[PDB]
Amino acid sequence: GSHMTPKDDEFYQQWQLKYPKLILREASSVSEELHKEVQEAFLTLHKHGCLFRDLVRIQGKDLLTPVSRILIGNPGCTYKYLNTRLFTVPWPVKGEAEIAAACETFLKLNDYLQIETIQALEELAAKEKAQDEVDIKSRAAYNVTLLNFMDPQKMPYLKEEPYFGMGKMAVSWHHDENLVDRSAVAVYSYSCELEGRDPDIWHVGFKISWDIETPGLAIPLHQGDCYFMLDDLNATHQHCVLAGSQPRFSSTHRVAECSTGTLDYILQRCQLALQNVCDDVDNDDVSLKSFEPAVLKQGEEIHNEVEFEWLRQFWFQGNRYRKCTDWWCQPMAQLEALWKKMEGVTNAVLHEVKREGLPVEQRNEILTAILASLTARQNLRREWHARCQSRIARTLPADQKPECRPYWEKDDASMPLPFDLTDIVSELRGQLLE
Numbered sequence: 001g002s003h004m005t006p007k008d009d010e011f012y013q014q015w016q017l018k019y020p021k022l023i024l025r026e027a028s029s030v031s032e033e034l035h036k037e038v039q040e041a042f043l044t045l046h047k048h049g050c051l052f053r054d055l056v057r058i059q060g061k062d063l064l065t066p067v068s069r070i071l072i073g074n075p076g077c078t079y080k081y082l083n084t085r086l087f088t089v090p091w092p093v094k095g096e097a098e099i100a101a102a103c104e105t106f107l108k109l110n111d112y113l114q115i116e117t118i119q120a121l122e123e124l125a126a127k128e129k130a131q132d133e134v135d136i137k138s139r140a141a142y143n144v145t146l147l148n149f150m151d152p153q154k155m156p157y158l159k160e161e162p163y164f165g166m167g168k169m170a171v172s173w174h175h176d177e178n179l180v181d182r183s184a185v186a187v188y189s190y191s192c193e194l195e196g197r198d199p200d201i202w203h204v205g206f207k208i209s210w211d212i213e214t215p216g217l218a219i220p221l222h223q224g225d226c227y228f229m230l231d232d233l234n235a236t237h238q239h240c241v242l243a244g245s246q247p248r249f250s251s252t253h254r255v256a257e258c259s260t261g262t263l264d265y266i267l268q269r270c271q272l273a274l275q276n277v278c279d280d281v282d283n284d285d286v287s288l289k290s291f292e293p294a295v296l297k298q299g300e301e302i303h304n305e306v307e308f309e310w311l312r313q314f315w316f317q318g319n320r321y322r323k324c325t326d327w328w329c330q331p332m333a334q335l336e337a338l339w340k341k342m343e344g345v346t347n348a349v350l351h352e353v354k355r356e357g358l359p360v361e362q363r364n365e366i367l368t369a370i371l372a373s374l375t376a377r378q379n380l381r382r383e384w385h386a387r388c389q390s391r392i393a394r395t396l397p398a399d400q401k402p403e404c405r406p407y408w409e410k411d412d413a414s415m416p417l418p419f420d421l422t423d424i425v426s427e428l429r430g431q432l433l434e
């Protein structure tokens, strides 16, 4: 395999022929006022220490990401990649002062890049022609941007690009996950400073999925250049980042698929689960209205969703959002209080299966509905606490160390149930032996 750069004569016709949905807008197309404001916003956030490497999990192993990031976007929105849910540092859409100005700056860049995307998509459809204006606006309605930073000198050894000889990789081949179908991606690239591609210049590489025979493209990215992935390019093609000599920032604006990833959604899920609870007063006497299996199954599934997809995802990042914003403090306190009530709900269900007047075919109706949720609850609870207590988790600085919140001992009296459910879950299967 080989690759092509602007040094090659075939580079320009391959881009024209086989990458027409990849658009490059060089820094000359962007106002110099916007350049300085965006580049200073990058440095403002970097000085305040707002960008963090994530401790993700890929195929069983825990990995520190080579790139430090921060998610900025609509209030209450989340973006999930590599099993890590990032929460937006909010930007001011209608309805810490330095950091808030940087978020307003990248809100302005988002408006600009959204317009450029709509125009590029309109010019794209016209070329393919020779109702759908709703699709174009929605596929460019960016709700978040994932800011990035990497210093290549800090790595003792960078990975070689393994298929086309593109040299050192900062980020390996991948798709951008959890995006609205056929939504576009706009990137603002900010680089701080013969045989093949220039090793000192940052590039974005492109290849066709499953294809290492078709030579890939290595697009040089200078300071202030913008590139756009239109329509199904992000799905049909993979991209990587080829490292240069000096550090580089980037602002990657996305239409995150957030149908199950906003605060309003998960709060609504929590209210749906608590509709099966007598809500006169918030005490330890939790009494359920119905024990119909579908209602209890849905209740324990929502219980798991708020705990693992929201509570433990958030506190695994060790209150590092607090360095940027306080926006998630009350919502996370509210979600935990809602989750605590669901712990009392689970205790109430276990109290009912332990009751004498219950006929066995109603008792087994309940167990068949709740055991898949309780199984996943304990399997995921130890996966999360194991990741909180791993060697590489120790190596992180103090104010981003993973916290296994919520966590409590068997000594703790305020919680109706223990953290370890192995005795309880094994009991309920030994209960449908007899």
Ligand SMILES: Cc1noc(C)c1-c1cc(Cl)c(Nc2ccccc2C(=O)O)c(Cl)c1
Pocket: 056, 063, 064, 065, 066, 067, 081, 082, 146, 170, 171, 172, 173, 174, 175, 176, 177
């Ligand atoms: C997947 C995905 N979706 O959105 C983003 C952003 C990613 C994503 C984000 C990243 Cl930080 C990477 N890179 C890595 C992540 C963890 C460990 C190593 C690497 C690496 O490339 O060396 C990849 Cl491959 C993909």
Ligand SMILES: O=C(O)CCC(=O)C(=O)O
Pocket: 067, 146, 148, 171, 176, 187, 189, 204, 240, 241, 250, 252
């Ligand atoms: O850094 C970039 O240009 C975007 C590449 C990418 O997928 C990312 O790291 O977010």
